[PDB]
Write a protein that binds this ligand. Sequence first.
Ligand SMILES: O=C(O)c1ccccc1O
Lengths: 139, 126
Amino acid sequence: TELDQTAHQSDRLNNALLMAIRSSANVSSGFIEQLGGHDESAGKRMALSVELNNKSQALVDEFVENAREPALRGLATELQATFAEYAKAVAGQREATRQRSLEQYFKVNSDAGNAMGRLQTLRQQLVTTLSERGQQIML
Amino acid sequence: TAHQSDRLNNALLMAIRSSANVSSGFIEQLGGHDESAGKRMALSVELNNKSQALVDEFVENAREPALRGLATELQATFAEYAKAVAGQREATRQRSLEQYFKVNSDAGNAMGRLQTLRQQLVTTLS
Ligand SMILES: O=C(O)c1ccccc1O
């Protein structure tokens, strides 16, 4: 049944990164809605961005708990540390939205992109490692 | 089955990055970063073309009747998302905040459905 446990680890990964990117999509589009005077819609996107990054970090933390094989743990905790960096930058984008400052938005939008670029590469290496472990069981 | 999951997961990650880039690009236009906004727009076009190609490969390789209806639903829902993101791009080229807001709800709801659709598709891929 360790076979179906590598699939749960892979789905936690894919869901975490998808929601992590959806959260940045919500703050940027919410920032635009705010500049158009759509305060209510912008507030809902801020809340959705909070909820998505919290859900993603919960999956990430569940991911590193169940990653016990050392061929997997080395990439797992770098994914957690990189994500905490990504989460703070998106949180910085949200406070710039509430403050209506393009200045603060550009200040941390480069941080979010850098951490997201490393998150996507870390997912690729982790997905390959999980797929390799699952295949190792069938042979 | 491994190629289908890679197509599905990469298609969705690239589709959401295509949207995040046009919103980023729109914000750069508001700040006077016209050259940097053009680079976000081009990357959004490319991510959309690549994710559309993966969705097409996925649907063609999803023949087992347990997946045929779910694959077609993914295709149509993905079409709704891409159309909205294309509307985000055209609202950006016309520098219209109101046109951006109109299509933003269509993109958010479609991607919320794609998130649940992808989960159901990979459990049927087991
Ligand atoms: O994924 C979302 O929730 C979303 C929201 C607004 C715009 C584009 C999007 O993908």
